[PDB]
Symmetry: C3
Subunit: 332 residues, 3 copies
């Protein structure tokens, strides 16, 4: 036999009242599908003659091997966005603008404005502290090979009249010179000074100097001729003082050189020699000594003579003259 089954379009069955007997097959002509009845339900409620369940399929894929939207998002949440992170290059770029501890080159100004913890006292104080105890190099080196400038190499300035510290303070222990100033014998000459000092304070000495030398001068001044010409430096002097009055003032009464010995000295107060030969000196007691002929454009007030080599007085002459006068006048 060639069996044919109850048949009509899917659309047609869906509204038909035909009840297929149990296991009787129904055929959807427009789809080609079929359904079997259970003897009581209408076509549209029967099920197809073969499974339609995903769990029953063969060759299914690996669904569990696939990533879920949620799963991925959770993981992506832990990852850093490009926009909120610097690239190694950008980091390098910003780091190269910073100074290394190992050292570097500043091209701008470095200002110091200390909060000041307590800023100490002694060998660990200072905005800038340099300890050279373990190296043999220099501490601060400042130089200029420029033809001119509008400022000094180093400048120290205090402002208040109550400032109770020093500008510069040197505590020195060693075998050489503490402060060494050397003004190179210039090329284009100038009328300057190696060290220039000015004080407007009237109650304190411009410069104070105390030494405890055994066989030297506290202050040793040495002038050396700048020429080989015997009398080139005939205007020079090792030490020249000037006592001058004030700007539109009335005058001055200051003294030139004041020598004193508050505790009493034994030596000579003023000793003047040439080629290491005493030529003039003022002993500690006041008596002076002069090696060569001298001159006074005035009179000399002194004690009468007692020795044959003493300068004689008017009174001494007039007395000897008078006595001779009396002596001689006997007459006849």
């Amino acid at each position: 036999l060639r069996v044919q089954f109850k048949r009509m379009k899917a659309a047609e069955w869906a509204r038909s009242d035909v009840i297929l007997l149990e296991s009787e097959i129904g055929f959807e002509t427009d789809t080609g599908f079929a359904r079997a009845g259970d003897g009581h339900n209408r076509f549209s409620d029967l099920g197809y003659i073969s499974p339609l369940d995903y769990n029953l399929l063969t060759n299914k894929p690996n669904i569990d091997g696939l990533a879920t939207k949620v799963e991925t998002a959770q993981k992506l949440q832990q990852k850093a966005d490009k926009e909120t992170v610097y690239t190694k290059a950008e980091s390098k770029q910003e780091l190269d603008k910073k100074l290394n501890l190992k050292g570097g080159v500043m091209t701008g100004q470095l200002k110091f404005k200390p909060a000041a913890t307590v800023a100490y006292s002694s060998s660990t104080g200072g905005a800038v502290n340099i300890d050279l105890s373990s190296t043999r190099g220099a501490g601060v080196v400042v130089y200029s090979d420029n033809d001119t400038s509008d400022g000094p190499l180093m400048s120290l300035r205090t402002g208040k009249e109550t400032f109770n510290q020093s500008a510069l303070f040197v505590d020195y222990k060693g075998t050489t010179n503490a402060v060494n100033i050397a003004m190179r014998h210039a090329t284009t000459p100038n009328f300057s000074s190696a060290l220039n000092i000015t004080s407007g304070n009237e109650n304190g000495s411009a410069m104070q100097l105390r030494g405890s030398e055994k066989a030297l001068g506290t202050l040793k001044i040495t002038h050396e001729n700048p020429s080989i010409g015997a009398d080139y430096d005939k205007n020079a002097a090792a030490l020249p003082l000037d006592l001058s009055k004030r700007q539109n003032g009335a005058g001055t009464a200051a003294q030139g050189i004041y020598i004193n010995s508050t505790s009493g000295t034994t030596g000579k107060l003023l000793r003047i020699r040439n080629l290491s030969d005493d030529k003039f000196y003022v002993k500690s007691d006041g008596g002076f000594y002069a090696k060569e002929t001298s001159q006074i454009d005035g009179n000399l007030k002194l004690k009468d003579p007692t020795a044959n080599d003493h300068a004689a007085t008017k009174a001494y002459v007039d007395k000897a003259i008078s006595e001779l006068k009396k002596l001689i006048l006997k007459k006849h």
Copy 2:
């Protein structure tokens, strides 16, 4: 006809011995599915009357377009976790705490403790090296407008007695003053000094000074009256020395002023003038000159007179007196 087929529950077939002929259909009443026999196999081993193969389905999805767990994880492995990376903000935060090469403001102390490569010698040495050869600004500028402080602006200190370098060393070439110290004429006066120097070393001069001036003083001291009152500075002096003994000592024999010329000079060793007029001077040979009347509270030991204007001696008077005595005494 209304064909009905061999039928029983899925559970029932699974254990039945009924062998469906080839192509004969079997019907599962509780599921509604059917299977056709191959003429030898039991129901449970037949297959459904329609495919159950995922590869055969229509409208399948895009399985290959879906991401695999493995695939994603491999990619996520290359990505940087949030927890192990600084955000641009955090980076900025840490970078702003660092000093720029362009310059900045230090608010704390900067200590230097040089490893010391060799720390050089000359114009590239120093923990801090400042080269002002191409700019016109200052090098180191240190100032304080505070009313007081517990420390100095700049302090240099060496510790060992064998230290063979100087605290401060100035090598100067230029047209102005190498070191310029200026102590402003104070407001609240003090009994200080612009420059104060003290040496405890007995084998070396407190201060050494050498110059090669053509027409000046190596050391030029100038005192200017602080007042317009003619005799306000009657106690002052340009230069005052003091020769004092030690703490609970026995005395001192030091000399005040020592002038010498080891190579022999032509000039005047001591020249004292007023208004640029010679008033007193000690020639190079020792002879002195005095412009006005003088006084000696004692005797003067000198050579006999040869000129009519020479101070005469005792011996000269007594001789002329004696000769006149003899001369006169003839008598009768």
Copy 3:
């Protein structure tokens, strides 16, 4: 009945000319599947007797819940690769090599080579600017407790002969000493100096000093015996000058001490005292005073006597002698 259907292998149907009537079932013996005809199409073009449409399956999975390759890649594109980002550790590593503004420790050299904006003038200039107006600490502190070294603590050097600024410049307002130099009384003695100054410039004074003291010395020199032995410092002096010629030169004519008062002074130009007692002095007018007996190894040229206590001249003696001679000679 036991119905059997038209049947043959899938391979066999695919090339058969058999036309199954509408709803007549065909059976693939090698697969076990079946197809129903539509009365005109060949077997291979009929469809299976049950759906094969993914949309129709039950228990489908959550396909939309799965992540797409595209979707993931787009998201991963925003994330930062490990290879192009520094880890917090690497960042810390590089940041710890940089100096903090709060301060730190330099272990290398810090060079300054100012672009120089204009580098100012006054209290904000300098490569290094230190403002201590709000703290009581030190500014620059430089010390060395090393036994020796090959360089100085601080060194300033200018190169051109046209340099128109000073090496070091101190502007000081306060109650103490501007520059304070102290050379500790050495352990291993040396033949140095606290301050050593040398000038090769012939047109300017080695050292210039100006003060406006009311009752002091501009320059105050004090020598204190280093011993308690009364005559230990019998070679010393507070101030010793030396006038020397040049290297293989001809001689020198320089002067020792030059005292002048360009504006005219009232005081004593040279005052020498012992225990605060005048022993010798040269008045402003040139007349000198000597407390004790003196000596001249030569002659003294002076004015004739007018007072009984004036040193008498040759001429005065010879005149009084002559007058007595005439006077006496009357005879008989």
